[PDB]
Amino acid sequence: GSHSMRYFFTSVSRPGRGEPRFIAVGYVDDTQFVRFDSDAASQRMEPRAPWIEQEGPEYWDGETRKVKAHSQTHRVDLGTLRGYYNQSEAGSHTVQRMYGCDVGSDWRFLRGYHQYAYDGKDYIALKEDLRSWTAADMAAQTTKHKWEAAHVAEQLRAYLEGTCVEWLRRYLENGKETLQRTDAPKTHMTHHAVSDHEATLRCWALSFYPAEITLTWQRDGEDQTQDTELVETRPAGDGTFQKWAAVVVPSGQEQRYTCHVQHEGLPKPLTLRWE
Amino acid sequence: RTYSGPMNKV
Amino acid sequence: MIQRTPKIQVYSRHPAENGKSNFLNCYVSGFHPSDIEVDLLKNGERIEKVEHSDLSFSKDWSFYLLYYTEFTPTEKDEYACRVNHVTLSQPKIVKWDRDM
Ligand code: NA
Structure with missing residues (x-):
């Protein structure tokens, strides 16, 4: 690259x-x-x-x-x-x-x-x-x-x-x-809920190099930016980087949402879904 | 490697 | 003169596992001017051995630094980063959340 x-x-x-x-x-x-x-x-x-x-x-x-x-x-x-x-x-x-x-x-x-x-x-x-x-x-x-x-x-x-x-x-x-x-991100998704009405899904990318990465949420395969948060890419201290993206979703709708990861280290776009 | 200059003043 | 207030992230190098040595990081970025006070706290007390990266900056000219210390996380202990800058009327404490 x-x-x-x-x-x-x-x-x-x-x-x-x-x-x-x-x-x-x-x-x-x-x-x-x-x-x-x-x-x-x-x-x-x-x-x-x-x-x-x-x-x-x-x-x-x-x-x-x-x-x-x-x-x-x-x-x-x-x-x-x-x-x-x-x-x-x-x-x-x-x-x-x-x-x-x-x-x-x-x-x-x-x-x-x-x-x-x-x-x-x-x-x-x-x-x-x-x-x-x-x-x-x-x-x-x-x-x-x-x-x-x-x-x-x-x-x-x-x-x-x-x-x-x-x-x-x-x-x-x-x-x-x-x-x-090129170190492909190690990826996972977590789930957090503090009420019966909504949950937060957080998509994690860890241990990657170079720092350039794209994390995007979709709902039913359409780009989703409302009710999302994307932290600045940050150094791990060992020469690799970290990033996460989060989305707040209505309870019982977790399966509509997918996190999409693009990085030079991946042979294809990765897609993550809850569980 | 670093620019060999000269470094012109502003 | 253009001034910008720091962004702060507090996190570990590796996923936290109680009883296992790790590094506690405090990443300050997006600030201007470069003069900044950063301390890492354990249970509200200054940690003594803290190191930092060499001063650098981003496309917008704003500075960033990584402060870090070796530590073994535990059930009981809390950790934080304390930051002061000319743009802050008082120091800003951000607690470490092992899931952030
Ligand atoms: Na210019």
């Missing part, structure tokens, strides 16, 4: 509580493989999956050099953005950046991303054509013009279409045993 590599960077200013804190994390699909924490012991990019340990010292040195450089750029940006927005030196602010690439089943380039946020909202983003920018507001137009003049998009495009895809492929190969695995 399809795959992605993404990096997520967060920089936070804390006036009077030191200089800014910077965190970087890298993922292939739903598996984290590296981290950097500017306040942590090592002061290096660190491994967070076993297959990344195949990389040698030149890699670790390089990734460390780059991420420290990323962090120093954000330290400058935090100051710049306070000026752009006419803000005091007294409040705490947040810069976030995300970039990465998607490949299809054939491991060929599908699309690339590079987006930037300030204080929990969009600031500037590279458009899907990887040749143009979208500025979120008037302040960000200053940045857009700068980056256009400096041919930033061209530099980013070459990484996104080349290096990003090549390294995602390398990782997929080096970590084949775990990264290319």
Whole structure:
């Protein structure tokens, strides 16, 4: 199936509580493989999956050099953005950046991303054509013009279409045993009633990987959304995910309802019915 | 693997 | 500045079986800014050994973290997650329901 590599960077200013804190994390699909924490012991990019340990010292040195450089750029940006927005030196602010690439089943380039946020909202983003920018507001137009003049998009495009895809492929190969695995959800349905009039049916999906999954209820084979609840997919902590969907039904009508499970790990759509 | 930059300032 | 209040789920890694070691998870997500206070409780008391995942975020820029501790569930014991954030006027306690 399809795959992605993404990096997520967060920089936070804390006036009077030191200089800014910077965190970087890298993922292939739903598996984290590296981290950097500017306040942590090592002061290096660190491994967070076993297959990344195949990389040698030149890699670790390089990734460390780059991420420290990323962090120093954000330290400058935090100051710049306070000026752009006419803000005091007294409040705490947040810069976030995300970039990465998607490949299809054939491991060929599908699309690339590079987006930037300030204080929990969009600031500037590279458009899907990887040749143009979208500025979120008037302040960000200053940045857009700068980056256009400096041919930033061209530099980013070459990484996104080349290096990003090549390294995602390398990782997929080096970590084949775990990264290319599909763990079908273990599924079951429970029944709960607190009155004689209605019951809750809860359809469970456990121990699955990757995180992408669809749970849907039907009644007499027609899509059913009213009187339903669907929790956010959540990490088990062991590299797998969990999700449930519930529906409230009139007593004696449990058999009308079916839970439908779609996941990459299943050869077909699964259907569950009470009991 | 991580973008080799340069990281242009905003 | 855009602020968002955390979602909270409290659950175990594996199906709970009394007398069998497991992991108690508290997944906080959808929040902004990233500063957040999360404690795991046993019978209303802070658990001392608690770890957490590295800070990351979703498509909407909102943050998520998994806090977790090793524990062996029992007949008698209750567990919870206590969360404080700038968006909450007071800390929010969510009790662990082994069927949620
Ligand atoms: Na934007």
